Symmetry: none
Subunit: 61 residues, 6 copies
């Protein structure tokens, strides 16, 4: 491996943008909830994941 003259962006997350306004989010009766906004992940070598968002619940009433 070598790079005599190079520009190598590897595993990059750049120039992301988000504009939220006047939004609304409710949860009322939830066993397990997960709420996210922006999530930028960048890797080069991975044995697992990049983003995990699980939720396991129960609601009896």
């Amino acid at each position: 491996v070598l790079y005599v003259g190079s520009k190598t962006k590897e595993g990059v997350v750049h120039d992301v943008t988000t504009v939220a306004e006047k939004t609304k989010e409710q949860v009322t009766n939830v066993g397990g909830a997960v709420v996210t906004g922006v999530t930028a992940v960048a890797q080069k070598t991975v044995e697992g994941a990049g983003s995990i968002a699980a939720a396991t619940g129960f609601v009896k009433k």
Copy 2:
């Protein structure tokens, strides 16, 4: 492997954009919920996933 003169974007996520406004989201009776916005993942070598969002639930009433 070599790159004498190069520009190699590998596993890249760039120039993403999101504009949400006046939105609305509700959940009322959910075992397990998962709500997301933007999610930008970028990798070069992976043995798993890039984004996992599971939800396993139950609602008796």
Copy 3:
């Protein structure tokens, strides 16, 4: 492998765009729900997936 003079975008996700407004989303009685917005994944070598969104549920009443 070599690149004497090159520009090689490999596994790229660029110039994505989303504009949501005045939307609405409800879930009322769900075992397991999954709700997403934008999801940009980019890889170069993968043994698994790029985006997994499962949901396994139950509703008795």
Copy 4:
């Protein structure tokens, strides 16, 4: 004139929306140019106009 119980929107401009992307506009040899984007005007009583965009020119060469 009266309004015992009412909701009277008079001279209203609401819920406008515009999404431009990757566009292009050129002018090269123009006496007088006028370029506009969005223009929302709302009045209730007017003796003139609501939007005037004139352009008077000359190009000799």
Copy 5:
């Protein structure tokens, strides 16, 4: 004139929205140019205009 019970929006400009991206605008040889983006005007009683954008020019060469 009277309003016992009322909600009277008169001369209103609300909930406007604009999303421009990656656009481009050039002018090269112009006597008089005028370039605008968003322009929201709202009045209730007017003797003139709501928005005037004139341009009077000349290009000899």
Copy 6:
């Protein structure tokens, strides 16, 4: 004139929004140029205008 019970928005400009990104604007040889972004004007009684953007020019070469 009277308002026993009322909510009267008169001459209002509310909930405007603009999202520009990565744009570009050039002028090169212009007698008189005028470039604007957002311009929200609101009045109740006017004898003139709400927004005036003139430009009078000349280019000899």
